[PDB]
Amino acid sequence: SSNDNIELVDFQNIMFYGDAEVGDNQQPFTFILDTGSANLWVPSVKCTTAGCLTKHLYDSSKSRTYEKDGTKVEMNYVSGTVSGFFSKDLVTVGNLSLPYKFIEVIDTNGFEPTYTASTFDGILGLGWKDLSIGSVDPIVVELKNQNKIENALFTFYLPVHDKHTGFLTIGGIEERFYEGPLTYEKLNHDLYWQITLDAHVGNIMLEKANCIVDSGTSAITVPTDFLNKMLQNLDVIKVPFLPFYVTLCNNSKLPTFEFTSENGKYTLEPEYYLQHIEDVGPGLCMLNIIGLDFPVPTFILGDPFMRKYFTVFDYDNHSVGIALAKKNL
């Protein structure tokens, strides 16, 4: 109530979105609210690539507040690349506004076929400054300095398909979202929302694993080596060439992720990473887990995790809070 709330809706279960506007005239865009990146871009009316033909385009010539920058920038994500140029204008998230430096994307070719397929216009990073390009302070941070929000923190209470919507809450922790104690974990760097936990999936163990709480990832990421072992006798096939794992939804050998710290124990039961796919086969399910290797063992605690656990991203305390989410408001 005394905080900024953005509503979250989840359609297909690939990636949920949020709305926000750029420009003094409230030009509307659909954003992926990404804690894994630190920039905010929108497809420009200068965009020449095909992905833009069906997206909401920003037209700087229609906003009084627009302010030209022009320096070229490129964005590289795990899933793709987009390019354009910086610009400056009034960004509005929820019921708060502020002048901000964003990217007008004119080239999407390096983000296909995902971009055209998906139904979002751009991305809105919610990470740390160091991670950004063009030394841009996080929105939530700026909002705080400007005395526009109580605290420099934001929370995620993810939506669940065809059940209840979600919320991005800026500046305050609302207890309405969870139950039980909220256990804070320290970051090991002010780059990613990355903390250290022990990963004990079944009989496989990774002590002091690098963990990234990330709203921009639809799956649970795991080091390929670890995924292979982890599933070694649980009656789970890996598609011959296709990077998926199909299994029976009822498969009693499905494991439960268990990450532990001094302050908490977080578990992710099958019910949180199983994707029914009757179409393919009656009783079949695909695991929402995927391999992704970093130079140091790392897991990406994606949406499946944040969908069970309410999370607090606290800049002032350089830590991430975790609480069991209320199944319904």
């Binding site: 690939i14 990636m15 992926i32 990404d34 894994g36 990146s37 630190a38 920039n39 964005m75 590289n76 994500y77 795990v78 899933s79 793709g80 995902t114 991305i123 990073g125 991670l131 990613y192 990234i212 990330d214 921009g216 990832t217 639809s218 799956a219 990421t221 990077p243 995927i290 391999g291 992704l292 990406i300 994606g302």
Partner: peptide, 8 residues
């Protein structure tokens, strides 16, 4: 590619 908008 695994759907992840983490940047490097």
């Amino acid at each position: 590619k695994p759907f992840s908008x983490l940047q490097f």
